[PDB]
């Protein structure tokens, strides 16, 4: 695309600059360009990709929620403008999710052989189908939800076989899968069970960790705990 003429290393460098400048749309465009170079991504590069699109779609989701709430209050006298503008933001959000899912499908996942990369990408696939499900209405809502569930489940299966229970990727996957259960799949009991089991198995493995990894793992465990406190 428009990044085809830029060096891979230059794209990564500029993604880091864009992150420092809080220019997340630029950051995502740079990382998309890096992915399209066709080489596998390092751990640091995967995190740059995730941070960029998380912030872009995060802004879209927040905007969509504001507009959706105004629209439903409008239906509890005006014309079509609120619906039109909510639809505009929704279409842009869906476009970003489709872009991320397209990168994962072409061809990040199929080249990801190590547990840390494969689980990372499958978690991302679950996440961006989950964002699609947040705005989906009706029947293809069902198929989107199942695509998220399938991606998360495959990621979970690998992480349980290949990663210790304190691994931050494994913890973040379980956190997000539990949010999927609670918010999307209308399965709060499954959400609570997953979050509790994940927390407890990580707690029993903390003794193996260095001080730095201990900090990394307990930060995500706190997120699980925060959700359980909200949910129970």
């Amino acid at each position: 695309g428009a990044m085809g003429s830029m060096e891979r290393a230059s794209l990564i460098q500029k993604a880091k600059l864009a992150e420092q400048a809080e220019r997340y749309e630029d950051m995502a465009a740079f990382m998309k360009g890096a992915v399209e170079k066709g080489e596998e991504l390092s751990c640091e590069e995967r995190n740059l990709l995730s941070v960029a699109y998380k912030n872009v779609v995060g802004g879209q989701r927040a905007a969509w929620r504001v507009l959706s709430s105004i629209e439903q209050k409008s239906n509890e006298e005006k014309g079509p403008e609120v619906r039109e503008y909510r639809e505009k933001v929704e279409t842009e959000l869906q476009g970003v999710c489709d872009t991320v899912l397209g990168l994962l499908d072409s061809h990040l996942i199929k080249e990801a052989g190590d547990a840390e990369s494969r689980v990372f990408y499958l978690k991302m696939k679950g996440d961006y189908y989950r964002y699609l499900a947040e705005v989906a209405t009706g029947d293809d809502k069902k198929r989107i939800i199942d695509s998220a569930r399938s991606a998360y489940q495959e990621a979970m299966d690998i992480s349980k076989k290949e990663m210790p229970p304190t691994n931050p990727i494994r913890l973040g996957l379980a956190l997000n899968f539990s949010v999927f259960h609670y918010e999307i799949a209308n399965s709060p009991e499954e959400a609570i069970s997953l979050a509790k089991t994940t927390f407890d198995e990580a707690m029993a493995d903390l003794h193996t960790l260095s001080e730095d990894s201990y900090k990394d793992s307990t930060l995500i465990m706190q997120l699980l705990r925060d959700n359980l406190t909200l949910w129970t």
């Binding site: 913890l171 973040g172 997000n176």
Partner: peptide, 5 residues
């Protein structure tokens, strides 16, 4: 309902 950072 918080998701991963």
């Amino acid at each position: 309902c918080l998701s991963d950072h």
